[PDB]
Design a protein around this ligand. Structure first.
Ligand code: R45
Ligand code: CA
Ligand code: CA
Ligand code: CA
Ligand code: ZN
Ligand code: ZN
Length: 159
């Protein structure tokens, strides 16, 4: 349950870029992460560079202006606010992690799929195979799929 977006057109904006990855790789990871969720819902996501986006994507360090401070390398990798105005929906990634396109460090795509889950109103899964399982663990992103539980979860919220 919990809050949900009351529209099917949702915008996002990348507030800033980790220096860990090149810009196009960050854009790609985020775009593909939204696509994962749009593939199984009526939701559509558009990136904007100018304007008032629903979901702000932010990389930040330690105490960064909200009530969910980061903890340096390891521990919490990211956090996101559920649907709502203002800071609602926004997804924040811990810059003290080393973000990657791959298995080294912390994979941005996989983390973003999880965080966008939260941005859309999903909670955690008890399926060790679900992207909404509470702890990060790398899986081959080339064959990544939502689990049936993730799909049940998001379809119960939208459509
Ligand atoms: N423990 C781990 O496996 C890695 C660290 C590994 C490392 O050292 O690199 N950390 C993690 O997996 C941590 C653990 C957080 C904790 O202490 O409870 N989880 C997190 O960082 C959560 C964020 C996450 C999970 C995943 C994931 C899960 C399954 C498959 C693929 C990716 N991707 O990002 C944090 P959150 O759920 O958004 C969150 C944040 C703040 C609040 Br308040 C509430 C919820
Ligand atoms: Ca917002
Ligand atoms: Ca951390
Ligand atoms: Ca970093
Ligand atoms: Zn934050
Ligand atoms: Zn989570």
């Amino acid at each position: 349950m919990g809050p949900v977006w009351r529209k099917h057109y949702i915008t996002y904006r990348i507030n800033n870029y980790t220096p860990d990855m090149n810009r196009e790789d960050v854009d790609y990871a985020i775009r593909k992460a939204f696509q994962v969720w749009s593939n199984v819902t009526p939701l559509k996501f558009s990136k904007i560079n100018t304007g008032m986006a629903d979901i702000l994507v932010v990389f930040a360090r330690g105490a960064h202006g909200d009530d969910h401070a980061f903890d340096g390398k390891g521990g919490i990798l990211a956090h996101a606010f559920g649907p709502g105005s203002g800071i609602g929906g926004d997804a924040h990634f811990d810059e003290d992690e080393f973000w990657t396109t791959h298995s080294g460090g912390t994979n941005l795509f996989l983390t973003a799929v999880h965080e966008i889950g939260h941005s859309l109103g999903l909670g955690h899964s008890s399926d060790p195979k679900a992207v909404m399982f509470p702890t990060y663990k790398y899986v081959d992103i080339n064959t990544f799929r939502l689990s049936a539980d993730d799909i049940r979860g998001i379809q119960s919220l939208y459509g």
